[PDB]
């Protein structure tokens, strides 16, 4: 029962960033024998710690690792975006009390400015130099739309929408 893990914790990346898939493992491990599925085609690395690097629009998509003798894990979909803003999740569906984290993303990791998050139409939190809205104990109420607004540069941005569920 292997479970795939990302770094960053993002699943949501901008194009031309990196991220690094790990097979079941937090940090150290030893077969070479590892398997990698990008859209069911079975890919050429073996080693457990698949890189992606400049995130092109074809890197986003459905990924799974399997070992010789182990059942494939559970695919993860990594999405990848060109815009101003771009709001990032740790995971977009939770569990009621587990932690949670949303960032209001600005475009080649520039500097955004006078930043309030948004939670269905409302307006939830705000700050001058940006921030990440943390949550460790999430309640269920906790589940709702997510999406933030920046300034740039000197012009407003608004980021797409994004849903977040909370279970129990
Ligand atoms: C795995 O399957 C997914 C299908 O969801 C593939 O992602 C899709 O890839 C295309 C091409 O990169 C994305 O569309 C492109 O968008 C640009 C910009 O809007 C446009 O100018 C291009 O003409 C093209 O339409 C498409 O949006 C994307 N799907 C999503 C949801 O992001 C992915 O590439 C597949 N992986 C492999 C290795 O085939
Ligand atoms: C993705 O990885 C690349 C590679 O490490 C990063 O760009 C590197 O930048 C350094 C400058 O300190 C150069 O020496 C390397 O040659 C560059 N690598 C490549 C592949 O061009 C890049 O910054 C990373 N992406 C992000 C978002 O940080
Ligand atoms: C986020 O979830 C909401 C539902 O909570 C989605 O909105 C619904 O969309 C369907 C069809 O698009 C409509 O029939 C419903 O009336 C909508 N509900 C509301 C309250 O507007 C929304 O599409 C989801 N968005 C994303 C990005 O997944
Ligand atoms: C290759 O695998 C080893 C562990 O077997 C890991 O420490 C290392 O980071 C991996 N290298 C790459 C490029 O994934
Ligand atoms: C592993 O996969 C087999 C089918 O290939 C399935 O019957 C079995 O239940 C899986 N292992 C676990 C622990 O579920
Ligand atoms: C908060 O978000 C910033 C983005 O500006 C990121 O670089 C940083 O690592 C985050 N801080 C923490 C403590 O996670
Ligand atoms: C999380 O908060 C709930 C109340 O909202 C509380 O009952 C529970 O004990 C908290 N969990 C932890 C680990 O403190």
Redesign the pocket.
């Known amino acids: 029962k292997p479970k795939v893990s990302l770094n960053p914790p993002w699943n949501r990346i901008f194009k031309?960033?990196?991220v690094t898939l790990t097979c079941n493992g937090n940090n150290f491990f030893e077969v070479s024998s590892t398997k990698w599925f990008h859209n069911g085609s079975l890919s050429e690395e073996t080693n457990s710690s698949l890189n992606i690097?400049?995130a092109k629009f074809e890197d986003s998509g459905e990924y799974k690792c399997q070992h010789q003798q182990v059942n494939e894990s559970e695919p993860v979909y990594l999405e990848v975006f060109s815009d101003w803003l771009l709001l990032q999740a740790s995971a977009e569906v939770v569990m009621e009390g587990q932690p949670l984290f949303l960032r209001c993303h600005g475009w080649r990791?520039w500097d955004v400015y006078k930043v309030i998050y948004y939670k269905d139409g409302e307006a939830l939190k705000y700050w001058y130099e940006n921030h990440n809205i943390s949550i460790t104990n999430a309640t269920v109420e906790d589940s709702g739309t997510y999406y933030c607004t920046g300034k740039v540069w000197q012009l407003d941005y608004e980021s797409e929408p994004l849903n977040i569920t909370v279970i129990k």
Do not use: F, I, L, P
């Open positions: 031309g960033e990196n690097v400049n990791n």
